[PDB]
Design a protein around this ligand. Structure first.
Ligand SMILES: Cc1cc2nc3c(=O)[nH]c(=O)nc-3n(C[C@H](O)[C@H](O)[C@H](O)COP(=O)(O)O)c2cc1C
Ligand code: NA
Lengths: 195, 189, 199, 66
């Protein structure tokens, strides 16, 4: 048996087929979540306000991930895993998070910053749920260079591309912390020592 | 002005001069001076700058996309059939009318088209069948008669004695005119 | 315009309409494309701005064929102040982003030889750009001494005797007779390439 | 580096790397190849210069202008 759990913010919702077992814990998170969402507006214009059903499930993955412990296994782990599985089925369809993020930009009226939040939430969610990106990717580009219908050269920029270079670092550290945090931390410690 | 010297040169000579010159250079530069290497097509033209099986049946729903439908009835090979279903207009003696084959074969609920001998154009026959008082019957038979005459047989199955009646519409197919290859035989029409 | 529509609707064999001396607005183009049963529309942009206007017309009817007839100042009759090459070097990439544009090169052409490097696309090599092949060509001046044009016998003789000049010297028409051609203002003040007769 | 949308599709952003459909493999046009003039034969054996233009009008890609 399953049993529904409506995630909602104004007009938009996502019906969540939660197993009978995990419903106790799941509807707790649901309640504590619904209060931390701001008041709905027309168009869902406010910065921290999900414009699509996908963003909504995004914010929930991000919330539930924040209450999950990296060394021990708490009670929220079996819930996170089902929200991921549901998100991956309804919204990714086997494609990458970035491909979805680009749909929402041209197709819907989500902003860049709301999309960078969606990417953050899903990738943070994947690592905290002990589901790393171990599988080799179905990337169409990389398949094609694989078959020799394509070839890549990697180029690396220099100084002078924008006046606000450090914001690109912020964006990496904030968006992709779970992937890049170790590297930033190592780089910082390395440079302190160099000094 | 540096290329304008020979007075009273016929216009055909000037223009063919330029075209023939390009062919000569293209042949040498890319085809090893070999005319046998030049690909061939029954007729050349009618191609928008944007753009099988020998025995098939096609059923028109109310959702069937016109463009897919006509592309299907046309077939991939460029012949009288390709023109009949894709060529937008036909000639009626200097004047250009809407292609009546496309008009009659415009898809809608009930229509069933059967292509026999798809892969040999000389023999190909496309047959439109529609509901006629409950039972489904042939309304249109499209095929070559002689090598350069298309015949669209328009059939009324509701007649004075039950025996079906035929209007043989006849069209010349001239692949020397790629832009407007189909032209209605107007004589005795 | 109403004539073409009337005639077109009686099934007259008019294939296309070319608009000369500048490019219509989107609203007016949209009219010509949808009202006049034409199989393509020819536009004769004279400047980089005019080429953009042609692109925006193509953008707006992406399944309708547009013959973009590019033309230099070196052209005969009413002419621009523009180089024949720079505008195409700047815009070629943007033009080819629109499949429905059939890009035709006009002005100064007379033969298979001078015209061929534009068909190949090898012309743009000279300027350290990649090859840029063209879909077609138009010959205005070259054709004016054909047998079946109505140009008077002595007029053909006069046209013929014009030695003409290479592209690198064409702009001297503004000052003096150049290849036996001068430029000269119309009653409205637009420049015109005419043979430097006494008149 | 960045996720964004190129309206011209001139070039791609991070999406193109990870995308699994056709949309991951886009190639920019090589103009030489895309618009290469060609030769073609009617059934009567007449030879035409095959370009985007002649392919439409079924005549040589050459015109006397107004
Ligand atoms: C005598 C003459 C008359 C012209 N009349 C027109 C016209 O009515 N409309 C137009 O768009 N262009 C007109 N043009 C310009 C041509 O269409 C074309 O752009 C030009 O002749 C091509 O350059 P070329 O003559 O150097 O080959 C005329 C050109 C000449 C020489
Ligand atoms: Na001359």
């Amino acid at each position: 048996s399953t049993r529904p759990l409506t995630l909602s913010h104004g007009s938009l919702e996502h019906v969540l087929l939660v197993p009978t077992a995990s419903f106790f814990i799941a509807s707790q998170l649901q309640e504590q979540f619904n209060k931390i969402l701001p008041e709905p507006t027309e168009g869902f214009a406010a910065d921290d306000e999900p414009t699509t059903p996908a963003e909504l499930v995004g914010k929930f993955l991000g919330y539930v991930s924040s209450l999950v412990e990296p060394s021990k296994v708490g009670q929220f782990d079996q819930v996170l895993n089902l929200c991921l599985t549901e998100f991956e089925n309804c919204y990714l369809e086997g494609n990458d998070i970035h491909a979805l993020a680009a749909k929402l930009l041209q197709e819907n009226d989500t902003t860049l910053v709301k999309t960078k939040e969606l990417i953050k939430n899903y990738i943070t969610a994947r690592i905290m749920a002990k589901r790393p990106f171990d599988k080799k990717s179905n990337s169409a580009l990389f398949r094609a260079v694989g078959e020799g219908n394509a070839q890549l050269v990697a180029i690396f920029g220099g100084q002078g591309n924008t006046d606000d270079y450090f914001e690109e670092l912020r964006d990496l550290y904030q968006t992709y912390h779970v992937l890049v945090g170790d590297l930033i931390k190592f780089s910082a410690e390395t440079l302190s020592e160099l000094i | 002005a540096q290329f304008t010297k020979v007075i009273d040169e016929p216009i055909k000579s000037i223009m063919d001069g330029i075209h023939d010159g390009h062919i000569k250079k293209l042949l040498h530069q890319y085809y090893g001076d070999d005319e046998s290497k030049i690909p061939a097509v029954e007729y050349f033209g009618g191609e928008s700058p944007v753009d099988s099986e020998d025995s098939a049946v096609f059923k028109a729903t109310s959702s069937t996309d016109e463009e897919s439908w006509f592309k299907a009835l046309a077939g991939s090979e460029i012949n009288w059939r390709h023109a009949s279903f894709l060529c937008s207009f036909i000639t009626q003696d200097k004047m250009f009318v809407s292609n009546p084959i496309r008009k009659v074969f415009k898809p809608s609920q009930g229509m069933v088209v059967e292509i026999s001998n798809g892969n040999t154009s000389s023999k190909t026959v496309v047959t439109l069948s529609e509901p006629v008082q409950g039972e489904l019957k042939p309304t249109v038979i499209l095929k070559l008669l002689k090598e350069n005459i298309i015949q669209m047989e328009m059939i009324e199955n509701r007649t004075m004695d039950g025996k079906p009646v035929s209007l043989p519409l006849l069209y010349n197919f001239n692949p020397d005119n790629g832009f407007a290859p189909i032209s209605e035989v107007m004589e005795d029409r | 315009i109403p004539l073409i529509k009337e005639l077109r609707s009686k099934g007259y064999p008019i294939q296309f309409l070319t608009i000369g001396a500048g490019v219509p607005s989107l609203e007016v183009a949209s009219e010509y494309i949808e009202t006049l049963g034409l199989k393509y529309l020819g536009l004769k942009p004279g400047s980089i701005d005019a080429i953009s206007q042609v692109i925006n017309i193509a953008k707006a009817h992406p399944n309708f064929p547009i013959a973009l007839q590019w033309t230099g100042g070196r052209g005969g009759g009413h002419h621009s102040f523009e180089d024949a090459h720079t505008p195409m070097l700047q815009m070629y990439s943007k033009i080819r982003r629109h499949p429905n544009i059939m890009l035709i090169f006009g002005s100064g052409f007379g033969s298979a030889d001078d015209t061929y490097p534009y068909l190949t696309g090898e012309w743009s090599t000279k300027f350290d750009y990649p090859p840029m092949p063209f879909d077609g060509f138009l010959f205005g001046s070259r054709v004016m001494i054909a047998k079946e044009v109505k140009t008077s016998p002595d007029a053909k003789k006069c046209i013929a005797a014009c030695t003409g000049v290479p592209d690198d010297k064409w702009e001297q028409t503004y000052k003096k007779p150049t290849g036996g051609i001068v430029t000269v203002r119309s009653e409205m003040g637009e420049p015109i390439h005419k043979i430097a007769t006494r008149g | 580096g960045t996720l964004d949308i190129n309206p011209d599709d001139d070039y791609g952003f991070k999406q193109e790397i990870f995308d699994v459909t056709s949309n991951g493999l886009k190639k920019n046009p090589n103009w030489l190849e895309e618009y290469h003039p060609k030769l073609i034969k009617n059934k009567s054996g007449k030879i035409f210069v095959e370009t985007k233009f002649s392919k439409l009008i079924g005549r040589p890609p050459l015109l006397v202008p107004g």
